[PDB]
Structure formats: structure tokens, C-alpha cells
Amino acid sequence: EVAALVIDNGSGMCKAGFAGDDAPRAVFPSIVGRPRHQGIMVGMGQKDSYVGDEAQSKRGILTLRYPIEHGIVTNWDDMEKIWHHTFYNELRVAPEEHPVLLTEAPMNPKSNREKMTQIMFETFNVPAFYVSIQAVLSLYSSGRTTGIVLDSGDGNTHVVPIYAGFSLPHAILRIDLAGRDLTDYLMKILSERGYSFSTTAEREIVRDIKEKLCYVALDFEQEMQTAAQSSSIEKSYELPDGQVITIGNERFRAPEALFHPSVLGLESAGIDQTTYNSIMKCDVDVRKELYGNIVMSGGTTMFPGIAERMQKEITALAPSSMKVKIIAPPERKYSVWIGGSILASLTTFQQMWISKQEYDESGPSIVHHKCF
Amino acid sequence: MVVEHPEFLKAGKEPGLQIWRVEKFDLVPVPTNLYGDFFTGDAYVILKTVQLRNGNLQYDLHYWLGNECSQDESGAAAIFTVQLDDYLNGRAVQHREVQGFESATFLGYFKSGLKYKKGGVASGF
Numbered sequence: 388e389v390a391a392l393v394i395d396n397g398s399g400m401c402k403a404g405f406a407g408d409d410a411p412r413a414v415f416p417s418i419v420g421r422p423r424h425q426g427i428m429v430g431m432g433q434k435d436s437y438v439g440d441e442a443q444s445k446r447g448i449l450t451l452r453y454p455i456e457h458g459i460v461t462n463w464d465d466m467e468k469i470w471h472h473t474f475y476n477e478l479r480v481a482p483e484e485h486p487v488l489l490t491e492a493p494m495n496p497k498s499n500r501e502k503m504t505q506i507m508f509e510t511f512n513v514p515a516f517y518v519s520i521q522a523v524l525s526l527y528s529s530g531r532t533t534g535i536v537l538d539s540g541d542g543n544t545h546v547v548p549i550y551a552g553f554s555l556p557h558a559i560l561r562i563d564l565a566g567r568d569l570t571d572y573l574m575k576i577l578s579e580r581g582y583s584f585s586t587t588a589e590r591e592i593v594r595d596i597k598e599k600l601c602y603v604a605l606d607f608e609q610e611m612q613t614a615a616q617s618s619s620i621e622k623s624y625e626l627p628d629g630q631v632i633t634i635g636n637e638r639f640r641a642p643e644a645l646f647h648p649s650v651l652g653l654e655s656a657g658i659d660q661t662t663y664n665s666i667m668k669c670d671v672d673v674r675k676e677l678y679g680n681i682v683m684s685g686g687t688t689m690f691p692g693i694a695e696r697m698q699k700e701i702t703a704l705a706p707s708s709m710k711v712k713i714i715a716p717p718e719r720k721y722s723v724w725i726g727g728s729i730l731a732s733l734t735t736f737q738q739m740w741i742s743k744q745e746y747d748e749s750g751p752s753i754v755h756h757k758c759f
Numbered sequence: 760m761v762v763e764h765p766e767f768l769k770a771g772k773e774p775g776l777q778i779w780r781v782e783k784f785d786l787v788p789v790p791t792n793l794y795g796d797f798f799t800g801d802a803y804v805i806l807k808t809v810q811l812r813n814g815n816l817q818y819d820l821h822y823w824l825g826n827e828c829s830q831d832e833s834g835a836a837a838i839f840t841v842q843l844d845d846y847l848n849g850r851a852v853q854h855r856e857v858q859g860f861e862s863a864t865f866l867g868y869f870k871s872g873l874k875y876k877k878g879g880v881a882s883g884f
């Protein structure tokens with residue numbers, strides 16, 4: 388019949404599209420822009436709000452705001468704005484005409500979940516609704532029902548153990564550093580090299596440098612000295628002004644913070660140690676599969692060499708007899724979204740939706756057990 | 760459990776083997792005469808139902824992933840396996856069976872072995 392809409396609201400990037408598609412049609416920054424003081428003429432700031440790429444573009448005259456912090460909505464009015472934009476401008480459809488599948492971060496408060504449910508049924512009048520935990524969608528997209536998902540995006544890095552389709556909340560752990568932190572750290576060490584990246588445009592350069600030249604060192608030592616001697620690790624980066632600049636060990640030192648958060652003055656365990664800690668919080672019987680099904684998802688897990696290094700670090704922690712396997716699909720930046728597109732298209736899922744009818748009779752509180 | 764599908768209604772009723780193939784977001788039964796024939800481009804769901812002395816039924820759910828099956832198929836097979844398990848009140852053990860790394864148990868269901876077939880139904884994406 389009608390295609391369900393699938394939206395994965397990331398703290399930094401929103402992924403939206405139609406269930407049944409192999410990738411999100413719209414991927415844009417989770418930003419809402421408003422004129423400091425509005426205008427009327429073209430380029431004078433006519434609209435009273437901009438969302439996504441447009442907001443980013445015209446930031447010269449708007450004040451950008453990010454309604455999502457760590458996968459949790461902190462400004463519901465702005466959130467509603469992004470959702471409106473998503474339906475009407477991005478996907479270009481009327482919400483009341485399509486079941487909507489949204490995603491949520493692990494440990495999302497029950498109040499936010501209910502509030503999200505309320506807006507969808509009452510403000511956007513969707514006919515059917517569902518909320519899915521991000522880590523789980525990523526696991527399904529990887530073709531498994533059991534595994535431990537390491538989801539590192541822009542705001543939060545979580546490790547979510549899932550057995551036979553159900554995540555184990557008691558073992559879910561969070562690492563309080565993610566993509567934005569790495570961009571900020573790389574901007575730093577790059578400033579120590581004798582540069583300056585401080586504006587938004589400049590920070591985007593660093594983001595680009597981060598996403599294009601950074602990598603994770605298999606052995607942080609062997610590399611550090613490898614960059615210290617031979618200039619084989621070096622890479623030249625062409626800037627907007629045209630001039631080329633060379634990046635050294637900043638490439639592997641920035642993502643290294645993921646394994647040693649102390650470098651960002653953070654006292655938290657790294658992604659390797661945290662994965663092992665989570666697995667240890669799980670029942671003995673499931674630990675074996677978790678070890679053999681460590682799935683990576685999110686943009687910050689895109690660092691080349693990350694899978695190679697996680698394998699090494701984790702086999703070192705796991706019993707010798709343990710079969711450790713790291714799964715980092717090439718498309719892990721859309722793993723969450725893709726899982727939702729599959730889920731929402733299944734003939735069997737059609738009875739899973741929360742109906743407008745049941746919402747009407749029981750209210751927002753039914754969302755929790757309905758989407759268990 | 761809230762799932763309304765004709766195949767879910769047939770699953771795990773009597774002891775034996777049941778095989779379904781994933782065909783564009785649906786779970787479609789495989790003809791009993793073709794059991795053991797697997798398209799390396801497809802994903803399948805296998806249910807082995809066994810009768811216990813106490814009267815209960817024992818289940819083993821195997822989702823088989825062909826080497827060239829698309830993401831929607833492997834993804835769907837996994838989800839269907841979790842849904843079938845839930846529907847059967849969760850008395851089933853879930854086994855992920857990858858072409859070439861099949862469990863001895865799964866292989867044990869096929870007296871004449873498996874017949875791999877190149878190709879399969881097109882992706883549902």
C-alpha cells in the first residue's frame with residue numbers, strides 16, 4: 388500500500404526516507420536556524436525559520452540551534468520544526484498519509500518517548516507510528532539477531548548487547564565522547580602544528596580532514612615513530628584558498644582518543660575496554676556470541692583501521708579460546724536507517740504499528756510496551 | 760504474537776521441518792519437494808520442530824544466508840527469525856547459518872545434503 392516513512396534523528400545528521408529504499412533520500416544536519424532579527428526581501432531573511440543545509444548556508448544571518456543532544460531531544464519546539472521540514476520539504480509528503488518509524492537513542496527517557504509519540508499522533512496526525520532502538524536496527528541490517536553493537540555518532544558512543552533480538556539494558560554502556568569531540572580535538576592538534584581553524588567554515592575543513600585523511604593506528608607506537616622518521620605517513624590537503632597543507636600524525640592521533648579518552652582530558656574507558664566491560668556484564672552463555680558478533684555502526688566508526696585495531700585489542704581481553712570478530716559494514720553510516728527501512732517494509736510488521744485508534748483510547752504511555 | 764501472517768499460523772504445529780524463503784520483504788514457503796535446494800543469492804528461514812516426552816514442542820530456528828543475498832534479504836531473515844521465535848512464545852533456539860559455515864545440526868536436517876543454486880529472487884529494495 389503506502390510506503391512508511393523512516394527517520395533516524397541523529398544529534399548531528401538526520402537520515403530520512405521511505406521504507407523499502409536501500410538508503411535514506413535525505414541526509415541533512417539536525418539544525419534549526421532562525422533570523423536573529425527577521426526581514427522580508429530575498430536574502431534579507433524572509434522566512435522565520437530554516438532547517439538543515441539551508442540553515443547552515445545562511446548561518447550568516449541566522450542563529451543555528453541543535454534540538455538533539457546525545458540522541459535525546461532537548462528543545463521540542465525546534466524538534467517539531469525539523470520534523471515538519473522533513474515531511475513537507477525533504478520527503479515532500481503529508482505525514483497524516485504515512486505510518487512513521489522513528490528511532491531513539493539507548494536510555495531515552497520514557498517522557499521523551501511519550502512526548503515524541505504525542506506530537507506524531509496529535510501534531511502531525513500520523514495514521515501509524517513506531518519507535519525503534521537504533522543499535523537494534525543496525526544489528527538487523529547486519530543480518531543478525533545476536534551481537535553487541537558499538538554505535539558512535541556525533542553525540543554519543545554506546546555499546547549495546549543484544550541477544551536473540553532483545554537488547555540487554557543492564558549491560559548497555561556509554562562512552563561520553565563522539566564525532567564532534569574528535570573534530571574539536573583534531574582542530575586543536577592541527578593548531579599546534581601552526582594553523583588556525585576556529586570559524587564554522589574552518590571547523591568544516593577539519594571535519595573534512597578528519598573524514599578524509601584520519602585513520603586508526605594498529606599499534607599507536609609503531610606509527611608515531613613511523614611518522615617521526617619517514618615522511619611516508621604524510622598527506623597533503625588542498626584548502627579553499629587553494630594552498631596545500633600537509634597532515635602528519637594528527638591523522639591517527641585524533642581517532643586514538645576513541646581508545647584512550649584521557650587525551651581529551653576525559654576519564655572514561657575507551658571503546659575497546661568498554662565493549663569488553665559490557666560483554667562482561669552479560670550472562671556467561673551469551674558472551675561467546677557477543678565476542679564473535681561485534682558490530683560497528685555510525686559515522687565515527689568509519690575511521691579506516693578501526694576494525695583492525697578493535698580486533699586486536701578485544702582478542703587481547705577475551706579468553707584465548709574465544710573467537711573474536713568485528714563487523715564494520717561499509718555502509719555503517721546508514722546502518723540504523725537501513726535496518727528501519729527493512730523492518731518497516733516486512734509484511735509481518737504491518738500489525739506492529741501503534742494505530743491512531745489505540746493512541747486515541749490509551750494515550751502516549753502505550754508507546755513503551757508497544758515498541759518493546 | 761500480534762503478528763497476523765498465514766505462515767506464522769502454520770509454523771511449529773507438528774514435528775518436522777519447515778522452510779521459507781525471503782522474497783521481497785515477505786516470508787514465502789518453499790515447496791516441500793525442494794527442501795535442501797538453496798539459492799546462494801537468497802536468504803531462508805528454517806524451523807525444525809521436535810516433540811518432547813512431556814508433550815511440549817522443541818524448536819530450532821535457523822536463518823540461512825546465501826553468499827550473494829542482498830541486505831534486505833539477510834536483514835529480513837533475521838527479523839523474521841526473531842518474530843517467529845516471539846510468536847512461538849520463545850521456545851526456540853536461533854541459529855545463524857551462513858553459506859559455507861553451516862552447523863552440523865543444520866546439515867543434519869538434510870539427508871542428501873544441500874543443493875546450492877546460483878541466483879535467486881531479486882532484492883526487495
Ligand SMILES: Nc1ncnc2c1ncn2[C@@H]1O[C@H](COP(=O)(O)OP(=O)(O)OP(=O)(O)O)[C@@H](O)[C@H]1O
Nearest residue numbers: 397398399400540541542543566598685686687689
Ligand atoms: N568517513 C568518516 N570518518 C570519520 N568520521 C566520519 C566519517 N563520516 C562521517 N563522520 C562523522 O560522524 C559523525 C556523524 O555520524 P552519525 O550520522 O552516525 O551521527 P548522528 O546520528 O547524527 O549522532 P548520534 O547517534 O550521536 O545522535 C560526525 O562527527 C562526522 O564528522
Ligand SMILES: [Ca+2]
Nearest residue numbers: 800801879880
Ligand atoms: Ca536474492
Ligand SMILES: [Mg+2]
Nearest residue numbers: 397398540685
Ligand atoms: Mg546516530
